[PDB]
């Protein structure tokens, strides 16, 4: 008892010194002397949980809660362990018991709030975060997590004061050398300085270094030339998103397009096979595919990467779900670069480069990144739309009365043959137009009746609202649709006689200044509506309230549900103009809208995430859509909505340039990506440390 107290004290001491295994040995020795030692079981479980030994940590948590039935702190930390083991229901039970044992336990309410948050139940998360902050007013983790909840649903109550407090919390935590309560991925949404955002990321990169230093592994011996690889550069793509995820929707064609004479492609998957065609394609077209989800140990997984002789390891996650940045902290490869998946800096010294471009990351804001800049010639952004949605390369319209290109739209691999079977088809100078006749009335009747599909002249004509009933793999983008699809403004309640401004982003990317900008545009263009998504639905009443306070009636804003991927991209053809979010642009979402032929107005900022859209537009060749300030953004948007001849010109420009520009040309992108790889390698092979590659 007294001796066990001393042993638990020494283990706590050795724990603070970093000697984790000596702490474990001494915790076990305290349990050997006094088995019914709740604090020792709880201390040992916390140490095992930090080592990643979650099942073993669970054993000692269960002992602690039995010995001390009022040990609320143990229930809470046990729930934290179950959450990490992906037992969400079990974690909810532990948090619930912790709050029942001690209703004033602030940490337990906050942990319960995070379960509601991860589960999608934002109003319940907000309620539990506010209880935590009512119990403990000085609670950075709960305050910052509540702030992000309010961001998701566009609750901007006391927004300016909230932003000021978030900055103050980060400044204090960085000053007191603690891990910031703001997640590095969220830092783009808050008016933090570039220095603070880099420092937040740097603190997270140091966590990975701390986790790998306990492995006590030496530095790897890296290859010095390409002899052992037969002159080929070995590139390893590491991602948790080889499957149904934006990442594969952008780059699934790139591994199979690499030149095998000069490159050997290794894809390192951090997630298990989700059964989709996205995973099938990357597994089939990469030279090598390694499922690291079967190798939980970061030491053994890093050994595997080094064994393959990787020259350039590519971090496609950053600080996003499923990341294992410990792999990069171990440095199994001599060159390690950030690419595509994470729109921000890692802040970590083990990442050498960030692959970007001059429009996204001009040399002036290079102090925002810890990595050296590595420029792609046009944009670093890419998308697989030409392969996934070839049925949207061309379109035809039905004249339901001048002539509109975005009221009733047909798309399909076999559209031309269907058109050739119809009489009186007109070609506008080239867009085919079907006149209002028996064929056209049958299409509208299908839409109004909610019918799934019809047949005209033997051709399958599908309702664009019903793709999951016709071919679910086509609806998700895993297969190219094999019918002709109808898309109409009446399917979404859009006005037939007005300008449609759209934004299909998650609502969290909007802030008060952005919605005020949009309200100013709608007031100047009386014949117009704003088209947004329930993303999530609980954000809709907040947007509508703020719009009503700004003087916009309810009928000026139209909401649609989130749609399957193919319908999402296809319905963008119904808008006239996309109004991009300046706080954080459309990234995947901007490629989606441009593939539909929709002009996008953007106002680039300073952070990477606020400049992606302008870079896409610069590559597309539409400099006139990039605004230097909020007033120019409004002026551009209003001109597109009122100068109807200008609108037709710009829409024709976007429609053509999405094919003729580099933006969607994955083969060209891969070859420029390969040119940049060899610049990195030849720079390293000559014995130099990483430097900016900006020419």
């Amino acid at each position: 008892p007294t001796h066990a107290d001393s042993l638990n004290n020494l283990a706590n001491i050795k724990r603070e010194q970093g000697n984790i295994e000596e702490a474990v040995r001494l915790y076990r020795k305290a349990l050997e002397v006094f088995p019914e030692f709740a604090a020792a079981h709880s201390n040992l479980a916390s140490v095992l949980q930090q080592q990643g030994k979650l099942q073993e940590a669970l054993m000692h948590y269960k002992e602690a809660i039995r010995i001390s039935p009022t040990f609320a702190d143990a229930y809470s930390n046990m729930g934290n362990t179950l959450k990490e083991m992906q037992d969400v229901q079990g974690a909810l039970q532990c948090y619930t018991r912790a709050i029942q044992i001690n209703p004033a336990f602030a940490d337990a309410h906050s942990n319960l709030a995070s379960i509601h948050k991860d589960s999608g139940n934002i109003p319940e998360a907000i309620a539990s975060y506010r209880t935590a902050l009512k119990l403990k007013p000085d609670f950075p983790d709960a305050y910052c997590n509540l702030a992000h909840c309010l961001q998701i649903v566009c609750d901007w109550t006391d927004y300016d004061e909230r932003m000021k407090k978030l900055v103050s919390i980060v400044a204090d935590q960085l000053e007191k050398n603690r891990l910031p309560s703001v997640h590095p991925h969220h830092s783009m949404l808050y008016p933090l300085s570039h220095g603070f955002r880099k420092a937040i990321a740097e603190r997270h990169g140091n966590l990975c270094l701390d986790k790998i230093n306990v492995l006590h592994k030496p530095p790897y011996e890296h290859p010095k030339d390409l002899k052992l690889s037969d002159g080929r550069l070995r590139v390893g793509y590491v991602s948790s998103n080889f499957g149904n995820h934006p990442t594969s929707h952008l780059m699934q064609s790139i591994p199979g397009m690499h030149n095998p004479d000069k490159f050997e492609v290794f894809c390192y998957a951090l997630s298990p096979d989700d059964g989709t065609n996205f995973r099938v394609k990357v597994m089939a077209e990469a030279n090598h595919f390694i499922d690291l989800s079967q190798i939980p140990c970061n030491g053994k997984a890093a050994d595997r990467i080094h064994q393959d002789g990787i020259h350039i390891l590519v971090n496609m996650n950053g600080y996003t779900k499923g990341a294992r940045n410990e792999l990069f902290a171990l440095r199994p490869a001599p060159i390690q670069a950030m690419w595509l998946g994470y729109p921000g800096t890692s802040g970590a010294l083990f990442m050498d480069y960030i692959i970007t471009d001059q429009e996204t990351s001009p040399a002036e804001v290079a102090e925002q990144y810890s990595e050296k800049l590595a420029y792609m010639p046009h944009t670093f952004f890419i998308g697989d739309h030409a392969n996934m949605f070839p049925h949207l390369k061309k379109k035809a319209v039905i004249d339901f009365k001048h002539i509109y290109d975005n009221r009733i739209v047909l798309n399909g691999i076999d559209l031309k043959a269907f058109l050739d079977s119809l009489p009186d088809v007109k070609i506008v100078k080239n867009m085919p137009v079907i006149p209002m006749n028996t064929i056209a009335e049958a299409v509208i009747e299908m839409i109004n009746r909610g019918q799934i599909q019809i047949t005209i002249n033997g051709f399958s004509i599908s309702n664009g609202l019903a793709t999951t009933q016709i071919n679910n793999k086509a609806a998700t983008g895993e297969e190219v649709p094999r019918t002709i699809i109808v898309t109409t403004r009446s399917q979404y309640g859009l006005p037939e006689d007005a300008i449609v401004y759209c934004n299909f982003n998650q609502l969290y990317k909007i802030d008060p200044s952005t919605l005020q900008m949009w309200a100013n545009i709608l007031k100047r263009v009386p014949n117009s509506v704003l088209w947004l998504l329930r993303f999530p639905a609980v954000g809709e009443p907040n947007i509508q309230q703020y719009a009503q306070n700004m003087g916009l009636p309810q009928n000026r804003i139209i909401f649609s549900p989130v749609a399957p991927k193919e319908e999402h991209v296809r319905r963008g053809q119904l808008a006239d103009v996309c109004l991009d979010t300046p706080l954080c642009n459309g990234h995947t979402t901007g490629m989606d809208v441009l593939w539909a032929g929709t002009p996008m107005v953007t106002m680039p900022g300073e952070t990477l995430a606020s400049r992606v859209a302008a870079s896409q537009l610069t590559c597309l060749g539409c400099l006139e859509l990039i605004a230097k300030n909020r007033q120019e953004y409004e002026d551009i948007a209003v001109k597109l909505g009122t100068d109807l001849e200008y609108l037709k010109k710009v829409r024709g420009k976007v429609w053509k340039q999405r094919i003729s520009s580099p933006l969607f040309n994955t083969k060209q992108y891969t070859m420029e990506l390969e040119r940049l790889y060899l610049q990195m390698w030849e720079h390293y092979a000559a014995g130099n440390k990483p430097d900016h590659m900006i020419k």
């Binding site: 990490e84 891990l179 997640h183 590095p184 991925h185 969220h186 997270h204 966590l207 998103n241 149904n244 995820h245 934006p246 996650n317 600080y319 996003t320 779900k321 499923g322 990341a323 998946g341 729109p343 999951t468 998700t476 998650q506 549900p561 989130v562 749609a563 399957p564 991927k565 990234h587 995947t588």
Partner: peptide, 14 residues
Amino acid sequence: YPGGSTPVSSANMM
């Protein structure tokens, strides 16, 4: 989407 799933870019746990 309602009735299925729409994966997005999201932060990792900390």
